[PDB]
Amino acid sequence: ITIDSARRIFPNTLQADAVPALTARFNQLSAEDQLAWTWFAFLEMGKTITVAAPGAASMQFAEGILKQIKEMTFEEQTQVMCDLANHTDTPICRTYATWSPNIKLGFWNQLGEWMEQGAVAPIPAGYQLSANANAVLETLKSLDQGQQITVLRSSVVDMGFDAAKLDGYTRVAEPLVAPKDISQRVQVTIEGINNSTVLNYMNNLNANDFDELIKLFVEDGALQPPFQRPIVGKDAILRFFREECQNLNLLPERGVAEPADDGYTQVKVTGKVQTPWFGAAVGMNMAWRFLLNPQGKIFFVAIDLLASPKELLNL
Ligand SMILES: CC1=C(/C=C/C(C)=C/C=C/C(C)=C/C=C/C=C(C)/C=C/C=C(C)/C=C/C2=C(C)C(=O)CCC2(C)C)C(C)(C)CCC1=O
């Protein structure tokens, strides 16, 4: 048993790889097309769902850069936005790179508001997307909403300076919320599954109880978010929880458990997940794939975004 082999459990699980597919196509576009594209994608999104107001604690980390941009001319603002899209080496792009996804999202949500308000340079009124950009946008509109918001988030996260090239830095993230009181936790129920570790995983995460959640993992275990590489080691996993996994609502529905190598157990769970950005307005179709050692500790868990609601019944 290795992490590489663990990634392969439950191979008939059909992930929504249309997301990385579309991201690849989007990445072929010019910075100018990218900004215009996302503006139109953002407006399209607004036809059905509204972004929740970012937390004040989150925005205080973006406030400095936002203030600087707001005081710029339209031409200067557009250049900064192009710099972010191009991953150009600039002070703003380097600052951006140290931010967690939620801070990056709150930052762009504010710029979007200011674009609507006339405070930040808008997309040119009669701007024409390239043929390829148009086609990418058409494909976006054809995907379910869970896949749509995942594409937009991924693109936001990938802007700015290459974080890897910053070497060591203080990571900027939202402050920790106190875990929910036990009496206030709404425990999950999973049809076909009684596994204590899986239930503890779901309930602790829903409670923002990361200190108890991390105890479920083995030292050298790993967690794999949708479409990215596994995050290895309890230290990295806990940091991921604290920085990116606050105020989620996991609503698992069904699951199955099977024997695995070396006395391990593998467990597949399907259900829905809500992000605090949209709440109940977007229930993403998810699968969890656990690999548990004989002591019931988590060696590996993959979290998949599924290709369609039909996959929820694929056990
Ligand atoms: C950029 C841009 C703009 C702005 C655009 C804007 C403002 C875009 C913003 C878009 C927003 C707010 C997107 C939010 C996405 C959140 C998702 C997909 C969360 C998923 C979480 C999941 C599945 C959780 C999963 C989890 C579970 C279940 C676990 O079990 C373990 C934890 C884990 C995390 C893995 C403008 C409009 C100004 C145009 C110019 C321009 O470029």
| Cα 194 to Cα 71, 259, 301, 313, distances in angstroms | 57, 15, 17, 18
* Closest atom of ligand 1 relative to the 244 alpha carbon: 34
Q: Do residues 200 and 217 touch, judged by C-beta distance below 8 A?
A: no
Is the sign of the CA dihedral 8, 200, 244, 112 positive or negative? positive
284: Cα separation from own chain's centroid:
11
Amino acid at 299: F
Closest residue to atom 27 of ligand 1, CA basis: 303
**Strand pairing class (298-305; 284-292):** antiparallel
Q: Do residues 254 and 192 touch, judged by C-beta distance below 8 A?
A: yes
Please give the torsion angle defined by the CA atoms of residues 115, 155, 223 and 270, in that order, rounded to the nearest 10 degrees.
80
Assign 302 to helix, strand or coil.
Answer: strand
Assign 256 to helix, strand or coil.
Answer: strand
- For the segment(s) 188-315, the CATH number from 3.40.50.1820, 3.90.45.10, 3.10.450.50, 1.20.1250.20 is 3.10.450.50
Q: What share of the chain is helix, strand, coil (3-state, %, to 5)?
A: 50, 15, 35
Amino acid at 120: V
| Cα 254 to Cα 16, 281, 293, distances in angstroms | 19, 21, 21
Closest residue to atom 4 of ligand 1, CA basis: 108
Place of tokens 């699968």: 287
Tokens linked to 25: 């196509």
CB atoms near residue 294 (< 10 Å): 9
User: What burial class does residue 77 get, using C-beta atoms within 10 Å of its C-beta: 0-12 exposed, 13-18 middle, 19+ buried?
Assistant: buried
Return d(Cα 172, Cα 150) in angstroms, integer.
21
Rounded to whole angstroms, the maximal C-alpha distance in the chain is 64
* Closest atom of ligand 1 relative to the 45 alpha carbon: 10
Closest residue to atom 42 of ligand 1, CA basis: 35
Assign 193 to helix, strand or coil.
Answer: coil
Give me the numbers of helices (H) and strands (E) for the chain, helices first please: 12, 6
Helix (H) or strand (E) holding 20: helix 18-27
Tokens linked to 292: 């548990």
Return d(Cα 167, Cα 164) in angstroms, integer.
6
Return d(Cα 81, Cα 37) in angstroms, integer.
13
- Give me the phi and psi of 213, to 5 degrees please: -60, -45
Domain ranges of the chain: 16-166, 188-315
Q: Do residues 69 and 80 touch, judged by C-beta distance below 8 A?
A: yes
Return d(Cα 284, Cα 110) in angstroms, integer.
25
Closest residue to atom 21 of ligand 1, CA basis: 275
Of 82, 100, 108, which is best to mutate to test ligand 1, by the most ligand atoms within 8 angstroms of its C-beta?
108
- Compute the distance from residue 51 Cα to the ligand 1 centre, in Å: 10
Return d(Cα 22, Cα 149) in angstroms, integer.
12
Is the sign of the CA dihedral 112, 114, 116, 120 positive or negative? negative
Is it true that domain 16-166 has CATH number 1.10.2090.10?
yes
Return d(Cα 256, Cα 191) in angstroms, integer.
9
Tokens linked to 2: 């290795």
Task: Please provide the distance, in angstroms rounded to a whole number, between the alpha carbons at the two ends of the chain.
Answer: 23
- Residue 19's nearest CA partner among 195, 165, 153, 210 is 153
Which of the 8 DSSP states describes residue 9?
S
**CA angle (155, 98, 157) in 5-degree steps:** 10
Is the sign of the CA dihedral 64, 277, 47, 132 positive or negative? positive
Helix (H) or strand (E) holding 217: strand 217-224
The DSSP line for 218-254 is EEEEEEE-TTS--EESHHHHHHHHHHH-TT-EEEEEE
Amino acid at 17: D
* Closest atom of ligand 1 relative to the 284 alpha carbon: 23
Q: Do residues 129 and 37 touch, judged by C-beta distance below 8 A?
A: yes
120: Cα separation from own chain's centroid:
26
- Compute the distance from residue 106 Cα to the ligand 1 centre, in Å: 10
Which of the 8 DSSP states describes residue 299?
E
Return the CA Rg of the chain: 20
**Strand pairing class (298-305; 217-224):** parallel
Return d(Cα 300, Cα 218) in angstroms, integer.
9
Q: Do residues 65 and 162 touch, judged by C-beta distance below 8 A?
A: no
- Residue 174's nearest CA partner among 56, 52, 54, 57 is 57
- Compute the distance from residue 196 Cα to the ligand 1 centre, in Å: 30
Method: X-ray
- What residues are in contact with ligand 1 under a 6 Å CB criterion? 35, 38-39, 42, 51, 105, 108-109, 111-112, 115, 149-150, 152-153, 156, 205, 225, 244-245, 248, 250, 273, 275, 277, 284, 286, 303
